[PDB]
Design an enzyme around this catalytic site. Sequence first.
Site, PDB file in Angstrom:
ATOM      1  CB  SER B 349      -0.932   0.010   1.208  1.00 33.78           C
ATOM      2  OG  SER B 349      -1.665  -1.195   1.295  1.00 33.78           O
ATOM      3  NE  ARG B 350       2.971   2.332  -5.924  1.00 26.17           N
ATOM      4  CZ  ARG B 350       4.259   2.192  -6.213  1.00 26.17           C
ATOM      5  NH1 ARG B 350       5.159   2.975  -5.635  1.00 26.17           N
ATOM      6  NH2 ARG B 350       4.647   1.270  -7.083  1.00 26.17           N
ATOM      7  CB  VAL B 351      -1.818   5.660   1.168  1.00 23.25           C
ATOM      8  CG1 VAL B 351      -2.228   6.514   2.346  1.00 23.25           C
ATOM      9  CG2 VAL B 351      -2.060   6.397  -0.137  1.00 23.25           C
TER      10      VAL B 351
END
Lengths: 151, 486, 105, 187, 81
Positions: B349-351
């Site tokens: 998950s890049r966030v």
Amino acid sequence: GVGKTVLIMELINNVAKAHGGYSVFAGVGERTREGNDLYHEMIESGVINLKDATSKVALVYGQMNEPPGARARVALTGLTVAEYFRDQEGQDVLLFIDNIFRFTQAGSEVSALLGRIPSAVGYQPTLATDMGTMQERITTTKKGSITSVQA
Amino acid sequence: DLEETGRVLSIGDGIARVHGLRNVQAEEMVEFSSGLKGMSLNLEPDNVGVVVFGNDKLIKEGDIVKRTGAIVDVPVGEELLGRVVDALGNAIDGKGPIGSKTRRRVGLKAPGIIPRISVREPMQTGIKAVDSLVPIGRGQRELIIGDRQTGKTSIAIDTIINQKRFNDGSDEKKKLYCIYVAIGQKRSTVAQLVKRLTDADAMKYTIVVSATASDAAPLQYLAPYSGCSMGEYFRDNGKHALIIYDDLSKQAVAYRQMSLLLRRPPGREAYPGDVFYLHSRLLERAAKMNDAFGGGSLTALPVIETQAGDVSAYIPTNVISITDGQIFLETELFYKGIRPAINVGLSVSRVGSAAQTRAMKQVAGTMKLELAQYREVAAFAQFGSDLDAATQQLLSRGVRLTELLKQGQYSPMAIEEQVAVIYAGVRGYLDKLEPSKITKFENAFLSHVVSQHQALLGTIRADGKISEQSDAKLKEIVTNFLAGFE
Amino acid sequence: DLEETGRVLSIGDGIARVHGLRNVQAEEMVEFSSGLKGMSLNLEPDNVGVVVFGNDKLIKEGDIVKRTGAIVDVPVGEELLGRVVDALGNAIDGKGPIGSKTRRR
Amino acid sequence: AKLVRPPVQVYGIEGRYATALYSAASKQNKLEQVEKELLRVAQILKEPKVAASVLNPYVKRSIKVKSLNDITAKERFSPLTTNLINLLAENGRLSNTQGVVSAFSTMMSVHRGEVPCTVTSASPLEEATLSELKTVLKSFLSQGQVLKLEAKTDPSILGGMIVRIGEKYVDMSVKTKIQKLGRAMRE
Amino acid sequence: TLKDITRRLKSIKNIQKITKSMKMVAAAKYASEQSARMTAMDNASKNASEMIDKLTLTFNRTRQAVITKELIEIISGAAAL
Ligand SMILES: Nc1ncnc2c1ncn2[C@@H]1O[C@H](COP(=O)(O)OP(=O)(O)OP(=O)(O)O)[C@@H](O)[C@H]1O
Ligand SMILES: [Mg+2]
Ligand SMILES: [Mg+2]
């Protein structure tokens, strides 16, 4: 090697005895040697009677020595023969398709002859112009139930 | 009542050539004689290539084709919640017309740079693995990629069901309206899905846009955009939506057939030259707005069905490049006992941390680190008796956590219960229990904590963190229950 | 005429685009004026595509192609035993003719 | 070289030659002349003799263009028409000639303002209402037009009338009425 | 061939991580022969890793070749109309 046609014949006879449903065997693009073997093995197994009207299966055979159009539309023929039983007599029919592989490769040949779709798309089970519109006819209507067994 | 019209030069395969229509627009909705609608996609000097949103058996040569004067649009509003519609908004649940008053285009532009804010508020799914290790936020695009029959639809259904606690609840800012675009799926499976979402009282806030396998390729192409417009309505009018495209690969296949029949130059794998344009303009509309625009949100969870882990194909590569992460499911995990079969190493998950409450962050940092330490040595198992004791404890705790990650179907856990069980799992309390009993434990322990300790969970949910007060109370409850567990 | 005979529009690479030959059937064996035979495989609206059963040197643009009514046919029987024949049933073992009384498509 | 495009466009090789001749005639003001001589040369090329000769695929291009130039030069053609003929011939596009002519004819069908409109009804009409209807559908037109009525009769619409004037299309027939009734009473 | 390349590369990955496990086990049992086993399995793992790198190069080459060939098929089938 394993006895498989015996299992198909057993499923046919059991659905025909337990329930009041018949069966359709589609032979889409298949070896006529195997097809004749199955026809005979069914005749001498009581599933088909050549001298009565109490046979428990209807056969639809499209052989491999027939054009791609044949071997592509021969899956829909048995499907329609089972659709009648379902949507006309409320049965729970048992529809066999000897191969989907044969059907999809026949559809790929059909679309290669028309030379309109690159031969890297083949038949798409989701598109309604190919296999999808067929595979969705085999469901549980609120009038009956087709079920498809595919070797 | 005079309408500019045209004749049908040719019909078939969902593609009608139309002579005339000298004033039709690109992407305009035309209307045939049989009542069928269509979209004029190709504008050529001598004819118009129209895609038909229906079956091509109701049109013959010379059939009259009327204009309508509007870009393809679909009705939006709260009058859609609870209904099952097709790709054009027409209700197929048989419960009367959609009483919506406003319509929205299917091909609108996504918000720019200014109307956006960073993804901060969590989008709780209810799956321990997803909510812990691969978190999702509101305004994020989290791909769900995997093979066939691995539990993608199931993760989407669990995420939809979980928002019941927030929807029936009182908070207006934590309500999340769901939307499930079904593309290329059997009608029977959509029926199972609707009966499952009404058995859980989840259809009260869900829309379903169904473009099934027997639906024409233009309908499967349009369905995701109709769904995304229905969601963009809430997103722009201050509310928080969530949309699941199940799946995007079949929408790409439908677009490929359409483009090949419209005589457009194929590209890699026969897809048109602009399928990346297709999916990226679909996905960039899932944004998170700011307080100067309404604070709304629209989370997208696109689904991708690969073939034997082939994420290096064309469409999987595109959708991986566009999204903000992925959740990789596996058939090997699906057979080796892990269900949900989430692959923790490949998923990302890049966030990530920005989309978690403080309690889940506190416990999940430690959990993810220990799971990395377990996977870096996981191949050393089946001979663990002959290696270092600290690495043996790593292996044992790793097995403990992995079985703490399994979860049943249609049972999305609340966030505080999630952090509670993960706490009881990562603090070593299960290095004494052998793995074959972790499910029994988790079940009985969670029942105990929700029955006898409701106030603790209430405070943890009202704060979102494990305060040292609640930390001591967790010490208390975990140790007292574990002392009594068989 | 242009119902039982045609005129080569083009020749090349063993493919003859023959004009006319309106009454020719598909997969039927026509005969060029040079003695070379061909099989009409493409029946197109404007011409016929004939695959040439030989060397396309002996065929020129404008030659006459005559229908024979005979689809491909090969001799059969026990007399063919021991003989090396070519794709059309002609002996190529240099041992005379073959006394085949029976033919077969 | 600037070209003057006709108000309506035809495509393919047909339309390309048609618009080429249209511009070549409007640049020296011979539309009517080349038009009538085109229809007459189309009649000439459709007489079974040269109509058969012209498509034979082996007749040499130079010999056939000179034969056709001989045959056309006797009708006292203006240089533009025989220029078109020789261009279509040495370019091997003779079999298309009449089609082109048709295009060109329809070309002029827009230069005179001739708007083709159909008013199809159940059964043939009597020309009193047909004349007042000529008046009614001539009413919508702009300055400087002439109209062409081609009415056909079909009982399949079982009443009403359908006015397809160019691209405008009103369907007042009772067929569309009853279909609207059914779609409304079902929805 | 792409699939046969994946077959051989998976074979070598298998035996590579096998020698990794056996190396770390023999290094556990190191607390003469056991030290020799440790170093020999270390060398075997490094050999299998360099073979994996070679096979990865070959695999990428074959993958590019396959994509180019399928594109050529598609465009040559479309360009015949
Ligand atoms: N978390 C789970 N635990 C146990 N079983 C599960 C879980 N999720 C799904 N299953 C089961 O695995 C089966 C397949 O799951 P699912 O249909 O959701 O995957 P899918 O990839 O979306 O299917 P498809 O390939 O048809 O699109 C289902 O019968 C479901 O009951
Ligand atoms: Mg199969
Ligand atoms: Mg699914």
